[model samples]
Every structure is written in C-alpha cells, then in structure tokens.
Target: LSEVDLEKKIQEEYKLWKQNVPFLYDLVITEALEWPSLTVEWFPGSEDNSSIQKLLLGTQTSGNDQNYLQVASVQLPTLDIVQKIHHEGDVNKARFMPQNPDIIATLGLNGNGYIFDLNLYREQPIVQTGHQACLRHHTSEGFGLGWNFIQEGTLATGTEDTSICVWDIKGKSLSLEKSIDVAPVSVYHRHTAVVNDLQFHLQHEALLTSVSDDCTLQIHDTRLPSSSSASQCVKAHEQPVNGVAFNPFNDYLLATASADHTVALWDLRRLNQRLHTLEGHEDEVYNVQWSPHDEPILVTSSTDRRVCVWDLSKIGEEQTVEDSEDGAPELMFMHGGHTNRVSDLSWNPNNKWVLASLADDNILQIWSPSKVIWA
Candidate 1:
C-alpha cells in the first residue's frame, strides 16, 4: 500500500479501537497511577527509569508551601513511604545525577541547588548552594542542569545568576570544575535575563547549549578557555526558550520549545538557522522530547492542556490522517484530566508506549497506548 493509504488504515484502526475499547478510563487511570509524578530514575541495569525511582511533589501548609522529593522502588508503585526531602523554597527542576544513578540534583525557589544521595533517606542534601541569583522574587524560579555531553563525570548548571558553571563530580567533592564567562558570551549583555535552561550535545562533551529569558540560545565549548566566550550562539526564539533537547539518535539535531507557542528544530552542523518550526501548541510550550525508539517522532506539552506527538517525517506536509478527523498528526492520545497546565513529559525507557507527565495537579499521569480503554 502507498504511504497515504497506510496512514489512513492506521487511523481507521485507531478509531475502531477508540470506539470499541471497554476499559478506556481504567487503562488511563491505572497507567497514571502506576506512573505517579515528580521524576523517576531507573537503575543502570534496569529496563527503564521506573525501578527504584524518585518522586518530587509540592505541598502547602499554614499558608506556606514547599517542594518535596521522595524516593521509592518501582516494585511498589503505590507505597511512597520514604521521608520527603523538604526544600527551603519551591522546587523548579529535579534530575538524576548523570554519573551516579543513586544521586539527584534539584533547583528551588530560593535560588539554591541541592544534591541528594538517594541511597541515604536523610533530608540533608549532599551539596547545597546558590549556583546563581534568584529571579522569581519569591513567586516562581528558574534553574537547569546538563550533564557534560562529552564527559561522563562532569555536569553543567544554569541559574538566575546569568551564568553557567561546569562541575566535575568525578571525585567525592562537589566543586566548580569550570565556569563559562556568559557575560561576554551572551548575545546581548544589556538583556541579562535569567537563564532558563541548559543542555549538552550528546555527541560533543565540550559543547554545551543554554536558553535564557533573554530569548536566545547560546552554545559554549569548554575546550576553549573561560575567556574564549561562546564558540557559537543561535537566536532560537522570540520568546523565552523554556526547554531544549538533543535528539538521542542524531547528534547534530536539536530542538527547543518556547513561550512563543512553537518548537524549533535545528541542525547544529549547519549553524544558527532553524531547520523547521513546529507550530501546533496554542499556549507556551513547556517541554519537548524525542522518542528513544524512533528518532523522527517528537512529543511536546503545553499550558494549552494537550500533549502533541509529531512525526518529523511529516514536516511541511499538508495532508492529515482521518483517524479521529482532527486534521492533527495522529493524535497519539490526548491526556487532559489535570485541571492545570501540563509542565513536563517523559517516556518510559522500557516501554515506548508509556508516558509520564506533570502539571500543577498533585498527581502524575502515565499514559500507555496498549492498555488504553476507550469509552
């Protein structure tokens, strides 16, 4: 069959399943419960990031609120019994330690970054310091972490300080391995906006990428001395570039999601010009990720209350699959039970069909296509 014909057949099959499935709600709810929120980290040998994972949640009491990080085993998905690591302020981001799966790093509202050892349930962080300045004025904050793309034992972080620091965690001591002079490296020094995110090119350890509220994506090469400045920088978006992700399969491919309601894909090998602008989200796009199994497929979430799956293979095409008659890319599935904006999206390493998403809602939802039951 032709490509168009195959796509039509796939859509028809999806509709038939959507219409006839009897336990649709159960499937969605069950998957959501199984993939509960905060972030989960799978061990190195495990099939996915679901085993012995950690959960980060926010709680408020007595008119004051703080973010909490909890660790538990995937074997018992429902029993989250570990003590919660309380943050001095709201937490904005948490990621597993790049070199050690047993450690995690978190950035909070007070403009401090905390490193925790999951093996120890204790509340005290392995390292706590303000890597940058605070930008939220006690309301919302921004911070980011990037593992050295080229080096296994190094990490890079960005903060409201308007600077990005590289850390060498190879040893037990946590100290600044190197600091990139972002002032001269930034495209516009006058617009010293807070850095929103940082990413490392998976193929190039010396290359690091960062996005800032100033509306530019800057690239720094560590091989150059601190005074060398950003080796390359790209004006990626008009609005704040909220997130940046590198394609797992293609080292030269990178993607950035922005408050401008668009996700732009770039070919780093070709320099600063965007290769494609994916315009589907109605509100600010908070996150974008490439599928681990399929390099051409990308997923994005936004305050618009929807998660869109795009096939890069269909870039610039006008044809729409008739599966649900939305004229949208095969709506892989729409997850909307949450009353607030969906802030993050992550796919299970072992199961490609499984997805975990976070929002203002206290609960994390897991979506799996195989178990989905239609009404």
Candidate 2:
C-alpha cells in the first residue's frame, strides 16, 4: 500500500475502535467511607471469591496518639470495613503475604514491620502467638515494602534513613539477607531523603527501582557488587518523586509520580529520556500505578482531589506542525468523587474494572467506569 493509503487505513481502524471500546465498563463502588491515611494497600486475594476480593487499609488520624491509628481489613464487592486492629501511632503501609494471604506485614511511623495473622472471624484483631520474626531495621519512616515477585518470603524495604534492606523471614527469625547502597562507599544510597517507594520488576527477580524525596529515581541491579552498585539514577522531578512503578506488560517502561503536578513515563532502554509528561492534576501528584490488567493504562492520584486514568496508546507524543502547544492528553476517565486530596489509589489486581482509593479528607472510594462515554 502507498504511504498515504496506509495512513488512511490506520486512522479509519482507530476510529472504529474508539467507537466500540466504550461499552466495556461497569462497576460498583462503595459510598466514600471515611478512611484517613497516607497509604492503603490492596492486592489480589489468593483465597477469595472472584467477584468479592478483600483489601487492607491503614489509618492516620488527627494526632500522633494510639487511638488515632489502626489498620482495617476490608471485605470487598460489598466494601465493608470488616476488621479493625489496633496499631502504633501510624500505620502507613500493610501488604498481605502473597504465598499465604492470611499473613499481613505492616510498617508504621515507629519504623517497625509487624506481622499480623488474620483470624477466622470477619471482624476482629489479628493475633500473634509468641512469634518473633520482623523487618524492623529502619531508623526512620519511609517504610515502603515490595515483596519479591519470584521468591515467596523475600521482601525489600526503603526507609526514611536513606537505606534499602532486603529480608528473609521464616519461622521465628527475620534475617537481613541483602543490602545495596546507591552511593555506596560514600553513603548508603541514603537517597539524601526518604525512599518514598520501590518496586521489583514482575518479570525478573533482580531488577529493582526506587523513588525518593531526593527528586530522583534510581534503578538498581540487586546482584551487583554491594560496595559499588550499578545504579542508573534519573533526575525525575523538580519536586520529590513520590512513587515509581514498572510497567506490568513491558519491563522497559516505568511510570513515576512526583510532587510537581505531573507524572512521567520513561523507557528504561533510553535512560534519561521521558516518553511523555502527564499533566492534568492541579497539585502535587503523589502516586502512579500501572494497570495490572496490562494495557498501557496508568492512574495517578494528586492533592488536586482528582484521579486521572490515562489511555497511554492514545496520548500524543508530539504536536502537529500547527505550532500550537500540545495540552495534556484527554483522559480515559477523570474521577472527582473524593471530597479531599486523593492521597493514594490502588487497582484491583484481579478485576480491571474496579479501583479503590483513599483521600486526605478521610474518604475511601471504590470507582468503576461504566459504559459509553466515548469521545
């Protein structure tokens, strides 16, 4: 086919898809329940009904007092807060064990990772029977945890003290199995700030990425020499890089959220180059997550009180010769259900249709996109 003819054919097919793809949405979100926290963790439940999965949420209430903080296990499909457990002064992160969904590992302001074993009852405190394994080596609070994708009990934690510690926990002992510093010999990668978040690539066990308050994202090869690490650092944002996630379907792509009102996508194959800079929110963008369902879809949460879901394939990489400044891409769906700054959001690992989130105004919302809003 001639070049002009091929271009015409592509546009025609794109139009057809744009028209038909809008019919595939339908969801049931719980009324925004009051959930105050800097973080909320939800994962695919290995042992739950397909239509009704469960999630874990942490609370950070008014003060640095005990009554103001706790973690709750939410029973989904119905979106009920089923179990509430007392926690430390702040419970910022909690993730269920992938191997045994019953065990949940949590980190709080006190810089300790506590293991909570869920009970048979739907509403109660999880228990511990004189057990002693832990992940509590952080001297400060950027307590973020990422479970090893291929290995079961192995996990990594990034701290406010500028350190990344990998651990092996079994029976009664939590052993520090590995430690890698970005700026080794000189310092403990110490990030120069809190390591806001880190992720292990879904395809391999050794590749990991960490984002930090230092306004940078560092890619680390866990197998590299510990004294002198192979760290590829990218000055990601003008403000702190709050979160970083590796694309699920493509290992070479990364999405980062920052306190600069934008989200950036980078192709790891071309270091220091950003494929696109997403801008829609009016405030600091605090989180970025790739859709677990695998399209090049991304969702970012910001203090602007909105969650913008982007259809990456449709986002234009550059403007036409018309010489006009290209605006941010049109959104797949722009959600404004939260009354306050949307602090964080998580995609349902099993169902692509549902998204759950928490906001600074003490609101928890379950969002589902529904039919035909094609544009």
Candidate achieving the largest TM-score: 2
TM-score to true structure, per model: 0.73, 0.78
Collision count for each candidate, in order: 7, 3
* Total clashing pairs in model 1: 7
Worst 10 residues of 1 by lDDT: 179-188
Off by over 4 Å in 2: 1-35, 43-50, 62-78, 119-132, 170-190, 317-327
Candidate 1 is scored at a TM of 0.73
lDDT, candidate 2, 1-375, per-residue tens: 697886576467546644543453354454444546666666565344445466677777535544222344444442565556666546677777777766666666556655555533335444223112345577776656777777676667787887887665545332223211121111235478898898888888777789898898888777665576646887988898888988888878988998988888898887677888887788888878888885678898888777888888767755564523434544577765665677778887865567888877677777667745423
**What is model 1's C-alpha RMSD?**
9.1
Which parts of model 1 have CA positions greater than 4 angstroms off? Answer: 1-27, 30-67, 72-83, 121-141, 173-191, 316-325, 328-333, 370-375
